[PDB]
Design a binder for this molecule. Structure first.
Ligand SMILES: CCCCCCNCCN(CC[C@H](N)C(=O)O)C[C@H]1O[C@@H](n2cnc3c(N)ncnc32)[C@H](O)[C@@H]1O
Length: 235
């Protein structure tokens, strides 16, 4: 009847006053990231972000949030990918991700770029998002292996991909989860995530404490490089 909070299992949430139909609709609705501080505040219809401006959750009083807008014109909208359109704005970074990870040359030899943490954080921390185009398992499983360097299964119906040329940071930096390299002693896992911009996707979540400038890795769980590293690790 007053402010309503809808939390996702991933830690993010929607907050605001609902309409007579109990819908998250209005000009003062917010999505709040899992840090419970970073927020997209503004215009939502039935929980869907129409115009979210970057904001900070300064305080909450009896469930009533106080938002303060961040400087600038950073605005976001629900912009779910299709099979061929990865994003309406490929070069607009995610502000939560931007504060937590960067891309640099991997420490794994001959592995290319990697994903690194900007910050020391604890276990179970969402660090990065894995958005991409949405194609079927049949399309993926029935094509050249070489097309599948960036494919990540989302669910039973959907596979996420970051195809050429979006695998280059110069062409796509809206999300960076596809830059995390593989390890058999990973410090992160892929996890489900409901994103106000990208919709249902996966994220990179730490398995434990990670330091600032530590490379973030995930076990790919299956490709040449991989079967070699496998032999290197069993020893
Ligand atoms: C669930 C299964 C996983 C699905 C998501 C996979 N997304 C992988 C993207 N690539 C990581 C980013 C790459 N380094 C780049 O510069 O865009 C992976 C590519 O990077 C190299 N790579 C990754 N891990 C490696 C390792 N442990 N050793 C050597 N090379 C590695 C290799 O070329 C691979 O195709």
């Amino acid at each position: 009847h007053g402010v309503c909070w809808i939390y996702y299992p991933d830690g993010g949430s929607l907050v605001g006053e609902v309409n007579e139909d109990g819908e998250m609709t209005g000009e003062k609705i917010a999505y709040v990231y899992p840090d419970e501080r970073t927020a997209l505040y503004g215009k939502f219809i039935d929980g869907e972000m129409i115009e979210g401006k970057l904001a900070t959750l300064m305080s909450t009083e009896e469930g009533r949030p106080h938002f303060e807008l961040m400087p600038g014109n950073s605005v976001y909208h629900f912009d779910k990918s299709t099979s061929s359109c990865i994003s309406t704005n490929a070069l607009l970074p995610d502000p939560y991700e931007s504060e937590r990870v960067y891309v640099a040359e991997s420490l794994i030899s001959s592995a290319g770029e990697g994903l690194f943490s900007k910050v020391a954080v604890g276990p179970n921390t969402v660090m990065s998002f894995y958005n991409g185009v949405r194609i079927t398992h049949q399309e993926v499983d029935s094509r050249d292996w070489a097309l599948n360097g960036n494919t990540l299964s989302l669910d039973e119906e959907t596979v996420i991909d970051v195809p050429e040329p979006y695998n280059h940071v110069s062409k796509y930096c809206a999300s960076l989860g596809h830059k995390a390299n593989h390890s058999f002693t990973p410090n992160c896992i892929y996890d489900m995530f409901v994103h106000p911009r990208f919709g249902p996707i996966k994220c990179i979540r730490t398995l434990r404490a990670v330091e600032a400038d530590e490379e973030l890795t995930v076990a790919y769980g299956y490709p040449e490089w991989y079967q070699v590293e496998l032999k290197a690790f069993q020893a």
